[PDB]
Amino acid sequence: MHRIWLMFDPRRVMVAMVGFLAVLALVIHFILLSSQRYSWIENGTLSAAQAPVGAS
Amino acid sequence: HRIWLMFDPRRVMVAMVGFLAVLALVIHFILLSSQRYSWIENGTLSAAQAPVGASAPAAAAEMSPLPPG
Amino acid sequence: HRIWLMFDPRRVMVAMVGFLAVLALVIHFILLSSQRYSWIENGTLSAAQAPV
Amino acid sequence: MHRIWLMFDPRRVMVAMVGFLAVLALVIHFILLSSQRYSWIENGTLSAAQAPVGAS
Amino acid sequence: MHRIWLMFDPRRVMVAMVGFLAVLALVIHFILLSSQRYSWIENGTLSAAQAPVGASA
Amino acid sequence: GSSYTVPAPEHTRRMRGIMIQSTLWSIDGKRSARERRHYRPQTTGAALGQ
Amino acid sequence: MHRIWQGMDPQIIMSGLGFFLAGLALIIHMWAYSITGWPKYKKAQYNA
Amino acid sequence: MHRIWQGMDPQIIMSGLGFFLAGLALIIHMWAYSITGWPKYKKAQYNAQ
Amino acid sequence: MHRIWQGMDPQIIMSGLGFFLAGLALIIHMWAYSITGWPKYKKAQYNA
Amino acid sequence: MHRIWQGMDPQIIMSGLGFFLAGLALIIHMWAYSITGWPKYKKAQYNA
Amino acid sequence: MHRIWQGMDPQIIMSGLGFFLAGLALIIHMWAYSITGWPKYKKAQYNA
Amino acid sequence: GGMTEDEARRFHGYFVTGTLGYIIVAAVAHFLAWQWRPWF
Amino acid sequence: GGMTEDEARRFHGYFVTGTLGYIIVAAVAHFLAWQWRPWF
Amino acid sequence: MTEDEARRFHGYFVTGTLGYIIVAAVAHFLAWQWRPWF
Amino acid sequence: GGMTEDEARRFHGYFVTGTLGYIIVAAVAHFLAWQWRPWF
Amino acid sequence: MTEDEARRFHGYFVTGTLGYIIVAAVAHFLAWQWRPWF
Amino acid sequence: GMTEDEARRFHGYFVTGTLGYIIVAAVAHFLAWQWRPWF
Amino acid sequence: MTEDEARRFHGYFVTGTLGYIIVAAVAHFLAWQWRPWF
Amino acid sequence: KGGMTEDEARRFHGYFVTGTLGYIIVAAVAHFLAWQWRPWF
Amino acid sequence: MTEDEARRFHGYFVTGTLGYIIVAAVAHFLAWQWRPWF
Amino acid sequence: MTEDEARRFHGYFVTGTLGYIIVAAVAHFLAWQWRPWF
Ligand code: BCL
Ligand code: BCL
Ligand SMILES: COC(C)(C)C/C=C/C(C)=C/C=C/C(C=O)=C/C=C/C(C)=C/C=C/C=C(C)/C=C/C=C(\C)CC/C=C(C)/C=C/C=C(\C)C(=O)O
Ligand SMILES: COC(C)(C)C/C=C/C(C)=C/C=C/C(C=O)=C/C=C/C(C)=C/C=C/C=C(C)/C=C/C=C(\C)CC/C=C(C)/C=C/C=C(\C)C(=O)O
Ligand SMILES: COC(C)(C)C/C=C/C(C)=C/C=C/C(C=O)=C/C=C/C(C)=C/C=C/C=C(C)/C=C/C=C(\C)CC/C=C(C)/C=C/C=C(\C)C(=O)O
Ligand SMILES: COC(C)(C)C/C=C/C(C)=C/C=C/C(C=O)=C/C=C/C(C)=C/C=C/C=C(C)/C=C/C=C(\C)CC/C=C(C)/C=C/C=C(\C)C(=O)O
Ligand SMILES: COC(C)(C)C/C=C/C(C)=C/C=C/C(C=O)=C/C=C/C(C)=C/C=C/C=C(C)/C=C/C=C(\C)CC/C=C(C)/C=C/C=C(\C)C(=O)O
Ligand SMILES: COC(C)(C)C/C=C/C(C)=C/C=C/C(C=O)=C/C=C/C(C)=C/C=C/C=C(C)/C=C/C=C(\C)CC/C=C(C)/C=C/C=C(\C)C(=O)O
Ligand SMILES: COC(C)(C)C/C=C/C(C)=C/C=C/C(C=O)=C/C=C/C(C)=C/C=C/C=C(C)/C=C/C=C(\C)CC/C=C(C)/C=C/C=C(\C)C(=O)O
Ligand SMILES: COC(C)(C)C/C=C/C(C)=C/C=C/C(C=O)=C/C=C/C(C)=C/C=C/C=C(C)/C=C/C=C(\C)CC/C=C(C)/C=C/C=C(\C)C(=O)O
Ligand SMILES: COC(C)(C)C/C=C/C(C)=C/C=C/C(C=O)=C/C=C/C(C)=C/C=C/C=C(C)/C=C/C=C(\C)CC/C=C(C)/C=C/C=C(\C)C(=O)O
Ligand SMILES: COC(C)(C)C/C=C/C(C)=C/C=C/C(C=O)=C/C=C/C(C)=C/C=C/C=C(C)/C=C/C=C(\C)CC\C=C(C)/C=C/C=C(/C)C(=O)O
Ligand SMILES: CCCCCCCCCCCCO[C@@H]1O[C@H](CO)[C@@H](O[C@H]2O[C@H](CO)[C@@H](O)[C@H](O)[C@H]2O)[C@H](O)[C@H]1O
């Protein structure tokens, strides 16, 4: 299993992994911030029963 | 397998990871843009309250001013 | 088998995989854009109540 | 009529034939799909008497 | 009569002939399809008396 | 408008470009092209008795 | 009379003759179905 | 008369004959279903039950 | 009659036979389901 | 009859057989659930 | 019968078996929760 | 290619008997289908 | 090229007996189905 | 490319072409039964 | 290659034993299912 | 590539292609059960 | 990369583990049936 | 890349593929419990 | 030289004329039966 | 580019061009029977 | 690199990855306490 590091450079893999993880985290945080239910900067103080819910 | 003699694992691994990434992102985005599976807004609804059969090409108004937001 | 002496198996398989992936994507997209087979929204409808 | 393969490379002939045939099949399928009479994805369950016909 | 092939390459003549013939067939089929009288995908089940005719004088 | 009513498919445009009526349709008059401008009417298998 | 077959492959002659006969038979069978009206009348009898 | 087979490949001949016979059988079976109307009437019997 | 098998790979033949049988069996099972009305009637009994 | 296994990997044979049996069992279990209506009726009995 | 494991290391086999058994147990536990009505009834009692 | 004269003779014999067997079997099938539902 | 004449003959024998077994078992299935819900 | 290889390839090509044409004929007959275009 | 004559024969024996056992237990499963909810 | 290499690749290619067609056929059978298109 | 004796011993251990798993699952299924039968 | 290296890589690739592929099956079953799509 | 030298060319002519004749007779019988079934004139 | 092989190629090419026109003439005959354009 | 260098890097990488997953899981548990999404 460790032998994968003889096929792929650990330096390149770590750099690519960090870049991907940062991009994914920023995208998820931004998607949540653009939503109605999870726009926590404005409505984060609401209780879970006061938070917006999509149309039923 | 002999498939790894014709195809170098180094290149096919990157192609495979890219394909799986784009496919998963496409499916999650399609689900997020649907009425029935827009889980970030309606995930707390039960299965009986979830929307059904709401294709409706003009499901929303096309022309309107911007909201105050 | 001797076709593979006239055509490279690597190139043939790469072209086949690419073409088949594109075709599958196109068919799934056409079905998703339709009214009768918009399964993300319609999937729970029975066949009688599906659009025609 | 095998001598045609001595004038034309079988490899290039077969590649060009496959490409032309695939494009032609796609064009015919989509011409049918876009028509009113032969949509077959919305109206495929209709019988031949209920299918649309062009205006007389 | 068969000396014509000594001035023109038969390999380069058949390819041009096939290409021109394919293009011409596609163009004619498409012109017919874009017309009203010969839109056979839609009105092909009509009889010759029911088929559309263009405006007269 | 305070509320919104979803129109019938036959009254809905397929093309969502804003200026399509004045840039193309005002100069286009092909019959089949005109037909493909809107969605087609729909029903259900039960309503058709099938 | 047989000298006309000289210098040609028997297989190509048979293949061309088979293509000729198959196409002609399909065309004439459709022509005859239209003239006689056979499948239509029998099918109408059975699909009453 | 057998000399027509000389110079060919028996596998190719069998493959082409199989393709021909299978396609012809499919086409004529659909033709016969339309003419006799067999599955239609038997399905009507077993679905009207 | 066995001389037809000469030169062919038995595994290729078995793969082709399995493909033929699976496709034909699927087609005819759907055909028979549509004809007999099974399992529609039993399913209707158990899902009243 | 055993000579059909000549030249083949036993692991590949077992992996292909396992894929076949898993897919077929899944398909037929779904088929049987629909036909018998078993989980549906027992869920209705327990969840009501 | 033991010769089926010749040439394959045990660690990979055990990891694959563990993956299989984990997935099966999770899926069948969800299935059983849906069938039996547990813990929905006990949760309803305790959240009254 | 292949199919020398002798194997051509043998294959012609086998092809002819197979063709005749197919012919007779189809004849019986048509005979039964005629009594079941004649098409003329 | 595989399947020389000897093993072609052996394979032919096994193929024929397998085909007969399949056909007879299918015949039993068809008899049972006819007793259950006859077609035409 | 000898004439032997050309002939051997041509046999396979003709067989494949015939298979394709026959399957297309079956498809066209099915489509005609479902919804005729003439 | 692999699975030589002795190995192929022993593999054939164990394969047949496994197939027989599998068919037997599946038959008992179908018998129980038929007693519980017959499908014809 | 040699002839035996071509034969060995042909075996896997043919088996994989045919098995893929069978799996697609089963998928179409399930889709027909859920919502027929004819 | 396993040998003949290694395969034999591994197969014995594998059989014993499978039997233990089966017995434990049988006991659990008996308890669950006594609690809430599913047929 | 030798044959033994391909064998060794194939073992790990197959086990990782299986684990990933039907950890996805667990995910799909959870989603079906929450909100069925058929 | 090429295909169907004079001897087998004559033999090919013999079989070909035989086949053409047989085809003509069987087609004549088919047209006869068709005429008694549904005459087209 | 010898005159004998050019004779063979002329025979084949003229026959092919000839048959193409005849098949197109039959196509036009069928089209005229279906929907005349004059 | 050598096999033992890859061994040591693999140990460190595996530990880091699993620790990251656990910390993210705890963050998700906290977010569930604040505002559940199902
Ligand atoms: C209404 C019709 C009748 C009936 C009438 C008949 C008659 C009559 C006959 C059969 C025959 C057979 N029938 Mg039936 N049969 C019925 C219902 C069934 C059911 C069922 C649970 O409903 C099953 C399992 C079977 C099974 C069988 C086979 C044992 C046999 C055909 C051999 C064969 O498959 O060759 C094909 C070989 C194969 C391997 C087929 C493979 C097909 C599967 C589906 C492939 C799966 C691939 C992959 C795993 C899929 C994954 C998909 C996922 C989406 C990823 N029948 C009903 C009750 N059946 C024939 C026979 O031989 O009988 C002895 C026969 O003559
Ligand atoms: C309103 C218009 C009509 C109609 C009117 C016509 C008319 C009229 C004609 C066609 C012709 C053709 N039509 Mg149109 N057609 C209609 C609808 C269709 C549809 C469809 C989806 O509805 C399709 C797919 C076609 C397709 C075709 C092609 C088969 C053909 C053009 C060949 C070509 O380009 O060769 C390009 C070049 C090539 C080299 C290929 C040649 C292939 C031909 C079929 C045979 C060659 C024979 C030659 C001697 C070789 C023999 C070999 C030996 C046997 C060994 N038609 C509608 C209903 N069509 C034309 C034609 O040629 O018909 C025969 C023609 O004249
Ligand atoms: C419905 O509307 C429309 C369609 C319009 C209506 C119109 C319909 C029309 C016009 C139909 C025309 C039908 C037709 C004619 O054209 C039909 C003609 C059909 C024919 C010819 C069938 C012939 C079948 C022959 C068979 C089965 C032979 C099989 C032989 C076998 C098995 C043995 C081979 C030997 C081997 C392998 C070993 C040999 C030794 C070897 C090798 C050795 O020794 O080495
Ligand atoms: C809306 O209406 C519009 C659309 C406008 C109107 C339309 C109009 C037009 C223009 C239509 C055109 C029609 C047309 C004609 O032009 C169409 C032409 C069709 C044709 C010709 C199809 C031919 C297909 C042939 C195939 C698939 C053959 C495949 C060969 C195979 C499988 C064998 C290979 C095996 C090998 C190689 C192994 C041996 C190798 C060996 C021994 C070795 O390697 O040595
Ligand atoms: C729902 O609607 C539709 C879908 C229409 C309805 C469905 C319809 C149809 C058509 C269904 C078809 C079903 C079918 C088709 O025939 C089903 C066919 C099923 C079959 C064949 C099952 C066979 C299973 C065989 C098993 C389990 C054998 C296992 C053997 C083992 C374990 C032995 C291991 C050996 C070893 C270890 C020796 C190693 C030695 C070595 C290595 C050495 O010696 O070196
Ligand atoms: C709305 O609908 C619209 C869209 C309008 C209508 C659409 C219409 C159209 C036009 C549809 C077109 C369909 C089509 C086109 O022809 C469909 C054609 C489909 C085809 C051909 C599918 C073929 C699939 C083949 C596969 C998957 C092969 C897999 C091979 C495998 C697994 C072997 C792996 C190799 C190995 C292991 C080698 C090891 C190395 C070795 C041995 C070594 O190194 O030696
Ligand atoms: C709900 O709806 C749907 C889902 C549709 C319903 C349908 C469900 C279906 C169809 C389910 C199918 C289930 C199934 C069968 O198919 C399930 C099959 C399960 C099986 C086979 C389980 C086997 C478990 C085996 C175990 C635990 C063995 C453990 C061994 C151990 C611990 C020993 C390890 C130590 C060793 C070896 C020593 C090393 C020595 C060494 C290294 C040395 O000495 O060298
Ligand atoms: C909305 O609907 C729309 C979207 C529109 C419809 C669309 C539908 C479509 C088209 C779907 C397509 C699905 C699809 C196919 O196309 C899906 C295909 C899926 C597949 C195949 C997934 C496979 C994943 C495999 C994985 C994760 C493997 C991991 C391997 C690991 C971890 C091991 C690696 C480490 C090693 C080896 C170390 C040892 C090295 C050693 C020893 C060394 O180096 O020496
Ligand atoms: C309705 O249509 C509209 C348009 C409305 C009206 C108009 C219609 C019109 C104009 C129709 C015109 C029809 C026509 C034209 O004249 C029709 C002409 C038809 C003709 C001539 C058919 C000929 C058939 C010949 C056959 C079957 C021969 C078979 C030979 C065989 C089996 C023997 C082969 C084997 C051999 C030799 C042995 C090899 C030995 C070897 C190699 C050796 O010995 O070496
Ligand atoms: C709307 O109305 C608008 C449209 C505007 C009005 C229209 C206007 C116009 C401009 C119309 C034009 C029409 C036209 C003329 O200009 C049309 C011209 C048509 C022509 C000429 C067609 C000719 C076709 C010929 C073919 C198919 C030949 C095939 C030959 C074959 C198969 C033999 C090959 C065999 C070989 C090679 C083997 C030997 C090998 C050997 C020896 C070896 O290799 O060794
Ligand atoms: C609506 O939202 C949308 C977005 C649409 C929904 C979609 C979501 C999707 C698709 C998500 C996809 C998620 C995903 C993909 O699989 C997620 C995958 C995540 C993964 C794998 C994370 C892995 C993290 C690993 C880490 C952090 C490892 C750290 C290791 C460290 C720190 C050790 C290194 C230091 C060393 C070694 C020092 C020693 C030096 C040594 C020894 C030396 O130098 O020698
Ligand atoms: C919608 O309605 C429509 C569809 C229209 C209505 C339908 C219409 C039609 C026309 C249907 C057509 C049906 C048909 C056509 O004839 C059906 C044809 C069916 C046939 C032929 C079935 C034959 C099956 C043969 C089998 C199972 C043989 C297996 C052989 C075995 C097991 C032996 C090999 C075993 C080994 C071990 C190998 C040893 C190897 C070696 C090397 C050794 O030992 O050396
Ligand atoms: C190993 C592969 C799978 C093999 C098994 C697949 C088939 C499954 C067999 C199901 C067998 C259960 O068998 C079934 O048991 C139940 C237990 O409630 C019995 O049920 C009986 O008791 C219950 C509850 O007390 C009553 O509601 C019911 O009316 C009565 O019949 C059924 O009469 C019997 O048919």
Q: How far apart are CA N36 and CA N34, in angstroms?
A: 7
Which residues does chain B have within 8 Å of residue C21's beta carbon, measured at their own beta carbons?
19
- Compute the Cα dihedral for N5, N10, N15, N20 and give only its sign: positive
Dihedral (Cα; Q10, Q13, Q19, Q20), 10-degree rounding:
-140
User: Around Cβ E9, how many Cβ atoms within 10 Å?
Assistant: 13
User: Around Cβ E4, how many Cβ atoms within 10 Å?
Assistant: 12
Among J24, J29, J34, name the best residue to mutate to test ligand 5's pocket (greatest count of ligand atoms within 8 A of Cβ). Answer: J24
Query: Nearest 5°: CA angle at H33, between H28 and H35?
Result: 90
Q: How far apart are CA S40 and CA S32, in angstroms?
A: 12
Give Cα separations from K6 to I5, J5, Q9, R15, U5 (angstroms): 34, 17, 11, 17, 30
Burial per residue of N19-35, b for 16 or more beta-carbon CB atoms within 10 angstroms, e otherwise: beebeeebeebeeeeeb
Tell me the CA–centroid distance for residue O15 and ligand 5, in Å. 10
Give Cα separations from I41 to H46, I20, I35, J27 (angstroms): 10, 30, 12, 20
SS3 D42: coil
* Dihedrals phi, psi of C44, to nearest 5 degrees: -80, -10
Among the residues of chain F, which ranges form H helices? 20, 31-35
List Cβ neighbours of U36 (8 Å cut-off, separation of 6 or more): A48, B44
Q: How far apart are CA D43 and CA C36, in angstroms?
A: 9
Q: How far apart are CA D20 and CA D5, in angstroms?
A: 19
SS3 F38: strand
Query: Nearest 5°: CA angle at P1, between O2 and R4?
Result: 45
T7 and chain E in contact, CB less than 8 A: yes
Tokens coding T36? 């005349």
Q: How far apart are CA R32 and CA R26, in angstroms?
A: 10
Q: How far apart are CA O30 and CA O32, in angstroms?
A: 5
Q: How far apart are CA C48 and CA O18, in angstroms?
A: 45
Assess contact for G7 and T12: CB atoms under 8 A.
Answer: no
Q: How far apart are CA J22 and CA J16, in angstroms?
A: 10
Which chain H residue has the Cα nearest residue G11? Answer: H4
- DSSP code, position J4: G
Give Cα separations from H12 to D19, L2, M9, R4 (angstroms): 25, 11, 20, 40
List Cβ neighbours of H1 (8 Å cut-off, separation of 6 or more): L12, S15
Q: Which residue has the tokens 């002798």?
A: L6
Burial per residue of A7-40, b for 16 or more beta-carbon CB atoms within 10 angstroms, e otherwise: eeebeeeeeeeeeeeeeeeeeeeeeeeebebbeb
Pocket of ligand 12 (CB under 6 A): H 25-26, 29; I 10, 27, 31; J 1, 3-4; M 7, 10-11, 14-15, 18-19, 22
List Cβ neighbours of B1 (8 Å cut-off, separation of 6 or more): R6, R7, R10
Nearest-CA neighbor of E38 among R30, C32, T36, C42? T36
Q: How far apart are CA T33 and CA E49, in angstroms?
A: 12
Q: Which atom of ligand 10 is nearest to the CA of D1?
A: 38
List Cβ neighbours of B4 (8 Å cut-off, separation of 6 or more): R1, R6, R9, R10
Instruction: Enumerate long-range contacts of U4-10, CB under 8 Å, 24 or more apart.
Output: U6/A2, U6/A3, U6/A4, U6/A5, U6/A6, U7/A2, U9/A2, U9/A5, U9/A10, U10/A1, U10/A2, U10/A4, U10/A5
Burial per residue of S17-29, b for 16 or more beta-carbon CB atoms within 10 angstroms, e otherwise: eeeeeeeeeeeee
Assess contact for H42 and I35: CB atoms under 8 A.
Answer: yes
Please give, rounded to a whole number of angstroms, the shortest distance from the CA of C19 to a CA of chain D: 11
Tokens coding F6? 């979803």
Q: How far apart are CA D6 and CA M19, in angstroms?
A: 43
Tell me the CA–centroid distance for residue R5 and ligand 3, in Å. 52
| The residue type at B31 | L
Q: How far apart are CA C40 and CA B54, in angstroms?
A: 9
Tell me the resolution in Å.
Answer: 2.3
Tell me the CA–centroid distance for residue Q20 and ligand 6, in Å. 44
Helices (H) and strands (E) in chain U, counts: 1, 0
Assess contact for H14 and L25: CB atoms under 8 A.
Answer: no
Q: How far apart are CA T25 and CA T27, in angstroms?
A: 5
Beta strand extents in chain C (DSSP E only) = none
The separation between CA R28 and the C-alpha centre of its own chain, rounded to angstroms, equals 13
User: Around Cβ I43, how many Cβ atoms within 10 Å?
Assistant: 14
Assess contact for Q36 and K33: CB atoms under 8 A.
Answer: no
Q: Which atom of ligand 7 is nearest to the CA of K14?
A: 34
Assess contact for G17 and S11: CB atoms under 8 A.
Answer: no
- DSSP code, position M18: H
Please give, rounded to a whole number of angstroms, the shortest distance from the CA of K18 to a CA of chain R: 9
Q: How far apart are CA C6 and CA K46, in angstroms?
A: 73
Burial per residue of D13-52, b for 16 or more beta-carbon CB atoms within 10 angstroms, e otherwise: ebeeeeeeeeeeeeeeeeeeeebbbbbbebbbbbeeeebe
The separation between CA M30 and the C-alpha centre of its own chain, rounded to angstroms, equals 14
Q: How far apart are CA J46 and CA K37, in angstroms?
A: 6
Best mutation target, S1, S8, S16, to test chain G (most G CBs within 10 A): S16
Q: How far apart are CA K4 and CA C32, in angstroms?
A: 46
User: Around Cβ U15, how many Cβ atoms within 10 Å?
Assistant: 10
Q: How far apart are CA J40 and CA K1, in angstroms?
A: 42
Tokens coding E55? 């405006």
Pocket of ligand 10 (CB under 6 A): D 1, 3-4, 6-7; E 17, 21, 27-28, 31; T 5, 8-9, 12-13, 16-17, 20
Protein residue with its CA nearest to atom 8 in ligand 8: C25
Tell me the CA–centroid distance for residue R20 and ligand 6, in Å. 24
Assess contact for F7 and F39: CB atoms under 8 A.
Answer: no
Tokens coding U36? 């559940």
Tokens coding J41? 């009726």
SS3 C51: strand
DSSP per position, chain A? -TTHHHHS-HHHHHHHHHHHHHHHHHHHHHHHHHSSTT-HHHHTTS-TTTS-----
H31 lines ligand 3 (CB under 6 A): yes
Which residues does chain A have within 8 Å of residue R12's beta carbon, measured at their own beta carbons?
1, 4
Q: How far apart are CA C44 and CA B32, in angstroms?
A: 18
* Dihedrals phi, psi of L32, to nearest 5 degrees: -70, -40
Q: Which residues pair with F44 in a beta bridge?
A: C51
Give Cα separations from U25 to E3, F28, N16, O5, S36 (angstroms): 84, 59, 58, 55, 88
Residue E52: asked if its preceding bond is cis (omega within 30°), the reply is: no
Tokens coding U12? 């460190």
User: Around Cβ T7, how many Cβ atoms within 10 Å?
Assistant: 13
B10 and chain A in contact, CB less than 8 A: yes
Q: How far apart are CA Q34 and CA Q28, in angstroms?
A: 10
* Dihedrals phi, psi of C36, to nearest 5 degrees: -70, -30
Q: How far apart are CA M1 and CA H7, in angstroms?
A: 19
Q38 and chain K in contact, CB less than 8 A: yes
SS3 R22: helix
Residue I39: asked if its preceding bond is cis (omega within 30°), the reply is: yes
Tell me the CA–centroid distance for residue T24 and ligand 2, in Å. 7
Phi-psi region of L3 (alpha: psi -120 to 50; beta: other; left: phi over 0): left
Experimental method: cryo-EM
Nearest-CA neighbor of G41 among S37, L40, D48, H29? L40
The separation between CA J11 and the C-alpha centre of its own chain, rounded to angstroms, equals 19
Assess contact for H25 and N24: CB atoms under 8 A.
Answer: no
Which residues does chain R have within 8 Å of residue B10's beta carbon, measured at their own beta carbons?
none
The secondary structure of I1-48, three-state, reads CHHHHCCCCHHHHHHHHHHHHHHHHHHHHHHHHHHHCCCHHHHHHHCC
Q: How far apart are CA P29 and CA P34, in angstroms?
A: 9
Breaks (C-N over 2.5 A) in chain U follow: none
Protein residue with its CA nearest to atom 34 in ligand 12: M15
Assess contact for T35 and E48: CB atoms under 8 A.
Answer: yes
| The residue type at D46 | L
Assess contact for N6 and D5: CB atoms under 8 A.
Answer: yes
Please give, rounded to a whole number of angstroms, the shortest distance from the CA of G48 to a CA of chain H: 10
* Dihedrals phi, psi of F44, to nearest 5 degrees: -125, 160
Assess contact for N20 and H15: CB atoms under 8 A.
Answer: no
Nearest-CA neighbor of P28 among I30, L40, G22? I30
- Compute the Cα dihedral for K5, K10, K12, K15 and give only its sign: positive
Go through chain H and tell me how many residues it has. Answer: 49
Please give, rounded to a whole number of angstroms, the shortest distance from the CA of D27 to a CA of chain F: 17
- DSSP code, position F39: P
List Cβ neighbours of I45 (8 Å cut-off, separation of 6 or more): none
SS3 S31: helix
- DSSP code, position F24: I
List Cβ neighbours of C4 (8 Å cut-off, separation of 6 or more): C12, P1, P5, P6, P9, P10, P13
Helices (H) and strands (E) in chain L, counts: 1, 0
The secondary structure of chain G, three-state, reads CHHHHCCCCHHHHHHHHHHHHHHHHHHHHHHHHHHHCHHHHHHHHHCC
Assess contact for H35 and N34: CB atoms under 8 A.
Answer: no
| The residue type at A20 | F
Among U1, U3, U17, U23, name the best residue to mutate to test ligand 11's pocket (greatest count of ligand atoms within 8 A of Cβ). Answer: U17
Q: How far apart are CA I24 and CA I39, in angstroms?
A: 20
I14 lines ligand 1 (CB under 6 A): no
Q: How far apart are CA T26 and CA G31, in angstroms?
A: 13
Query: Percentages helix, strand, coil for chain P, rounded to the nearest 5?
Result: 85, 0, 15
Tokens coding E12? 């380069």
Subunit partners of chain P (3 or more CB pairs within 8 A): C, D, I, J
List Cβ neighbours of N29 (8 Å cut-off, separation of 6 or more): H26, H27, H30, H31
